[PDB]
């Protein structure tokens, strides 16, 4: 309920948002909740340990 | 409101007036039967 | 400023409040004093009254004549003046030129004819411009009318509610 | 804002020095010569040349609706204006005489209501002082 | 997670950890802007306290630091003798709760606490031990 | 039909539906308290996990009252709405009707107090604004050691 | 973003203060002047120099009423009592000294520095001095008992100003480690903290009618607000080292730059209405020109600097200048000013 | 308006002045069957 | 009528005993402040206590807006109108 879908009168689907969370998650308290996935931190430890060997 | 606070001034004039005259009473009466217990007992001591 | 000085000992927020048939019987009382006495009509709480249309400083004799005949109207909400010529301004018909009519005779009805159709074609051209200009100004003028009746609307709530609520505080004091 | 003399906006709005009140120059002028140089609505003397401040602003500008763009329909709203301010004077009129009417009534009324009130007090505080002074005398038996 | 009053995620929360609430903490930006900038200023009042606050607090300092006084000189130099014969007791009225498995309500105790008498002989019982230093109050934010 | 509430808090917002054809009197209780300012300023006063979240004390006591209809009015149990999950609205009391100006947010199934307290509406929009204040630090009396003040409670419309 | 304030009001308009002049230039010392003390009566003042030595001259004539010994290192600090006749001295010797007026003698010794004082105030309504230096301790002592009642812990450098005033913050101290820290001097606990300042803040001053106070770190001065500590304006454009800092009872503030520059700004408004450049001594080096100590007699009409050239300069304000002769050149500039 | 205002103030001094003639009213009523119940009983 | 710095209508309209120019009472404060006691438009100093002046409403007579069926607005029209009449049949007799 927070972001609303409304067709409007020229047919297209349009999302407004009553709050800001959808755009930056300042005021969405669940900032903590976001998981990231293991590629993306395997890719994080893979870049520190290359600038460590380099 | 103005003549409600003049007409509560004098009925609360008039109430006191009125109290304290019944306490007048009151007390004329208490001195009364105070005068009238004396009485009682000067007439019994003077009997006895 | 009112002129009421007399004192009641009245307390409505603090006696008891007087049941109908008490309310009843205190009309009557006063009834029975209002008849015990003749009223007096030079009593100097009561304003003076009003003063004539001839002895009023501010009404002309023409308003004075107007106000008689309104009030002469047995209707003076439906009394409504004579219009006047509206039909001059309006197309001018051919006029009926007749056989037996003469040529200075016609020649006059065919000049004021004339003269009607160029005063309503003066008026109709005026019109017309008067169009065109609020076919230019009439979104701006509209909008300052709208918001200057809207502020002075406002202006009125406002004042109609400070009154209410000084009147609620003293009443709330009271 | 609005004229205080006819509740309208004033063409030439002019504030009074001590009272502060706007009304067209006109009016105030009438209306000063009339009640000899005093303010409308006020006991105190209002100077026309002097006691009256001009207010100086844009011009205002009233609605013209596209109905009255002709000289005679023109001429036909304001025949219909001032027949309606003649209603509205006499109606006016009218109320303030029923008013008056009603205003002596209720002063006779009131009146009256005084001096019941002021006789149902003087009755009671007899039965007051009757009751506050009612000595207990001896109840003798019949005997 | 709080939100402030144009609604945000507050972060004033981690510059205040580990202090109490009238530490005052510079935090955000709106520190680095003078007073008189910084939007809903109008007047300031910039004048001394009165003498009243001022010798209020003139006297609670001085309170405080008689104390201290009182303590530094009761160190410095000890009254040759430390005993103190007038023992007055302290009753204490002690309601006890439940504890230890049973619940039954205890009857409430009246407790006669009195200090207990010292040999004035005895030498300090314990040795001084020295340990390190704690660490900090938590460091406010950097403001340059 | 259901009307709006708007919970301003400082965890996030909270949207309350109210039910007017249920417990009408509390409804319209809630909204002239909510419209008036008089739920601008004060705080959640009493969180206990998996029991409560309420507030609404002038006072931020545990006694204040300002309800609209005097100082207190009577109950209004109706027995189609039970206390059944987490994040129902209910109007409280203390023992007999003596219902003020303090509301009552369930945060967990609470089957007993069904007939002591007035459920008059339900969190519509915000759910884990109400999960955060219920997972608050409370130190002995179940006042929280933060403060969860509220500041704007508005109909919107 | 942050707003701001379009009132244009937010800027005062400068007060017109006359220029300062060279008025005098006492020789004697044979150390740089890094302490000076008007008694409260504005008949004589104070100061201490690095040969370890306090003279004492009249005011009105620059004249040496008296040399005192005992310090064996450079004299810091030193204050006149206004309610005793006591003269308060520190040094870099880690010694602070309560000397009697009436006898010219130390009677006093407050010890338990470990490192050089820097700084020494008296509280102005309690019976209590406080010091601070390169221990990064605020000793608060009694005046009586000599006891150390207080040590005021949090600043990691050199604590090098200090001062006191009736109401809270009672202690003020700006450090070495570019920390300013206020101090309710009734429980020793910091109630504030500023990190506002780049480099280490070695001076400090409080205004004397209005409860604002202002520290000074190189190429920077602040105005700040108690009891809050909120920051009211900067002061802009001295490219030194400051060392000191002095307003007047007419709103001055004096900024001595250690190469010998000087500023003399308008309180309220921030506006510098003179930057001078102070003269060497004969026989000084380049170097040797900076200002060490700088303060007002009780009066304000005379500026008591030392110099690290060893001279006592005294300026005063010119007498024979108007608002037409040195025009105030400042204008509302709109600028956003990165802060 | 002059009128107006008058009308209301005297409308509400009538007011007040029923209520307190009701009020006087009761309190006479009162206090003469108070006498009369004194008249009748004798014992107090 | 509206305010000669804010340029709306003011709630409070105040009038300066100098000048004569109308504007809100917030406004002219700040205009004060700001100029230090300097009208709008005008190089004299003015008292934000004596020269301003309040204005002050009175709702005694009925309310007339200002619209084209006002007496008063018809009469302004018929003037402008005949105004305007006068001049063209000046200039149409002069080209004549």
Redesign the interface.
Do not use: I, S
């Given at each position: 309920?927070?972001l609303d879908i409304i067709e409007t009168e020229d047919g297209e689907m349009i999302a407004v948002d009553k709050?800001?969370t959808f755009f930056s998650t300042?005021?969405?308290?669940?900032?903590?909740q976001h998981k990231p996935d293991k590629a993306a931190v395997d890719r994080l430890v893979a870049d520190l340990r290359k600038a460590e060997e380099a | 409101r103005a003549s409600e606070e003049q007409a509560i001034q004098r009925r609360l004039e008039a109430l006191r007036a009125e109290v304290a005259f019944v306490s007048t009473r009151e007390r004329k009466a208490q001195e009364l039967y105070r005068k009238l217990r004396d009485e009682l007992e000067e007439l019994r001591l003077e009997q006895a | 400023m009112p002129a009421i000085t007399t004192v009641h000992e009245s307390l409505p927020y603090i006696d008891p409040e007087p049941t109908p048939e008490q309310r009843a019987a205190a009309e009557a009382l006063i009834a029975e004093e209002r008849a015990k006495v003749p009223d007096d009509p030079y009593h100097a709480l009561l304003p003076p009254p009003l003063p004539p249309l001839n002895e009023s400083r501010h009404l002309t004799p023409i308003l004075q004549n107007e106000l008689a005949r309104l009030a002469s109207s047995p209707d003076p909400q439906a009394a409504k003046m004579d219009a006047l010529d509206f039909s001059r301004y309006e197309a001018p018909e051919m006029p009926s030129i007749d056989s037996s009519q003469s040529l200075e005779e016609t020649a006059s009805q065919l000049w004021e004819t004339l003269k009607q159709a160029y005063t309503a074609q003066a008026y109709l051209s005026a019109r017309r411009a008067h169009l065109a200009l609020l076919d230019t100004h009439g979104k701006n003028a509209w909008l300052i009318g709208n918001w200057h009746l809207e502020g002075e609307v406002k202006a009125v709530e406002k004042e109609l509610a400070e009154t209410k609520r000084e009147i609620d505080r003293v009443s709330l004091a009271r | 804002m609005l004229c205080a003399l006819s509740g309208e906006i004033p063409e030439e709005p002019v504030v009074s020095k001590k009272t502060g009140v706007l009304f067209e120059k006109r009016l105030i002028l009438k209306y000063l010569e009339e009640h000899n140089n005093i303010e409308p609505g006020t006991t105190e003397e209002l100077d026309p040349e002097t006691d009256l401040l001009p207010i100086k602003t844009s011009r205002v500008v009233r609605p013209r609706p596209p109905n009255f763009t002709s000289i005679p329909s023109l001429l036909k709203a304001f025949q219909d204006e001032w027949d309606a301010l003649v209603l509205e004077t006499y109606t006016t009129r009218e109320q303030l005489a029923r008013v008056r009417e009603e205003l002596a009534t209720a002063l006779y009324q009131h009146d009256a209501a005084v001096r019941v009130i002021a006789r149902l007090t003087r009755e009671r505080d007899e039965a007051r002082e009757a009751l506050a002074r009612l000595t207990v005398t001896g109840a003798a038996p019949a005997a | 997670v709080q939100v402030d009053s144009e609604g945000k995620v507050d972060y004033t929360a981690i510059a205040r950890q580990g202090h109490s609430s009238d530490r005052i903490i510079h935090a955000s930006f709106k520190d680095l802007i003078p007073l008189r900038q910084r939007a809903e200023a109008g007047q300031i009042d910039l004048s001394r306290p009165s003498k009243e606050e001022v010798e209020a607090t003139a006297e609670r300092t001085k309170n405080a630091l008689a104390a201290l006084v009182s303590g530094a000189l009761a160190a410095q130099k000890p009254k040759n003798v430390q005993v103190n014969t007038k023992r007055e007791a302290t009753f204490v009225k002690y309601t006890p709760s439940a504890q230890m498995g049973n619940n039954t309500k205890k009857q409430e105790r009246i407790i006669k606490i009195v200090e207990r008498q010292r040999d004035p002989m005895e030498p300090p019982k314990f040795k001084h031990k020295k340990i390190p230093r704690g660490p900090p109050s938590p460091p406010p934010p950097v403001m340059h | 039909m259901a009307t709006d509430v708007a919970l301003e808090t400082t965890m996030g917002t909270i949207i309350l539906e109210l039910y007017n054809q249920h417990a009408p009197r509390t409804c319209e209780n809630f909204k002239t308290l909510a419209a008036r300012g008089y739920y601008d300023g004060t705080i959640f006063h009493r969180v206990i996990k998996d029991f409560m979240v309420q507030g609404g004390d002038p006072t931020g006591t545990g006694r204040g009252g300002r309800s609209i209809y005097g100082d207190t009015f009577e109950d209004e149990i109706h027995p189609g709405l039970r206390h059944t999950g987490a994040g129902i609205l209910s109007m409280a009391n203390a023992g007999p009707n003596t219902n003020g100006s303090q509301f009552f947010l369930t945060l967990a199934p609470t089957p007993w107090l069904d007939g002591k307290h007035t459920i008059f509406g339900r969190v519509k929009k915000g759910i884990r604004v109400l999960q955060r204040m219920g997972l608050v630090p409370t130190d002995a009396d179940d006042r929280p050691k933060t403060e969860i003040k509220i500041i704007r409670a508005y109909v919107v419309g | 973003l942050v707003r701001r304030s379009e009132s244009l009001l937010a800027q005062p308009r400068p007060d017109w203060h006359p220029p300062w002049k060279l008025m005098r230039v006492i020789s004697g010392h044979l150390g740089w002047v890094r302490a000076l003390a008007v008694e409260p009566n504005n008949q004589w003042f104070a100061s201490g120099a690095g040969d370890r030595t306090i003279k004492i001259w009249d005011l009105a004539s620059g004249q040496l009423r008296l040399t005192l010994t005992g310090h064996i290192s450079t004299v810091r600090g030193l204050a006149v009592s206004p309610r005793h006749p006591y003269m308060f001295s520190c040094g870099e010797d880690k010694m602070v000294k309560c000397w009697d007026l009436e006898t010219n003698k130390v009677i006093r010794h407050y010890h338990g520095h470990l490192s050089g004082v820097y700084t020494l105030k008296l509280h102005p309504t309690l019976d209590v001095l406080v010091t601070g230096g390169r221990d990064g301790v605020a000793r608060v002592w009694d005046m009586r008992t000599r006891s150390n009642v207080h040590v005021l812990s949090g600043h990691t450098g050199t604590v090098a100003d200090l001062v006191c005033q009736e109401a809270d913050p009672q202690v003020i101290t700006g450090s070495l480690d570019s920390t300013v820290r206020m101090w309710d001097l009734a429980a020793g606990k910091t109630m504030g903290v500023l990190t506002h300042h780049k480099k280490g803040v070695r001076a400090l001053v409080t205004h004397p009618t209005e409860f604002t106070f202002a520290t000074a770190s190189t190429g920077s001065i602040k105005q700040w607000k108690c009891p809050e500590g909120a920051f009211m304006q900067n002061f802009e454009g001295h490219n030194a080292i400051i060392n000191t800092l002095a307003v007047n009872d007419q709103n001055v503030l004096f900024s001595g730059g250690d190469n010998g520059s000087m500023s003399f700004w308008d309180w309220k408004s921030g506006y510098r209405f003179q930057s001078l450049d102070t003269t060497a001594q004969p026989g000084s080096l380049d170097a040797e020109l900076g200002i060490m100590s700088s303060t007002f007699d009780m009066s304000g009409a005379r500026l008591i600097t030392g110099e690290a050239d060893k001279t006592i300069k005294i300026w005063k304000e010119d007498t024979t200048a108007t608002p037409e002769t040195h025009p105030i050149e400042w204008k509302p500039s709109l600028v956003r000013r990165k802060y």
């Open positions: 309920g927070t709050d800001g300042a005021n969405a308290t669940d900032f903590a | - | - | - | - | - | -």
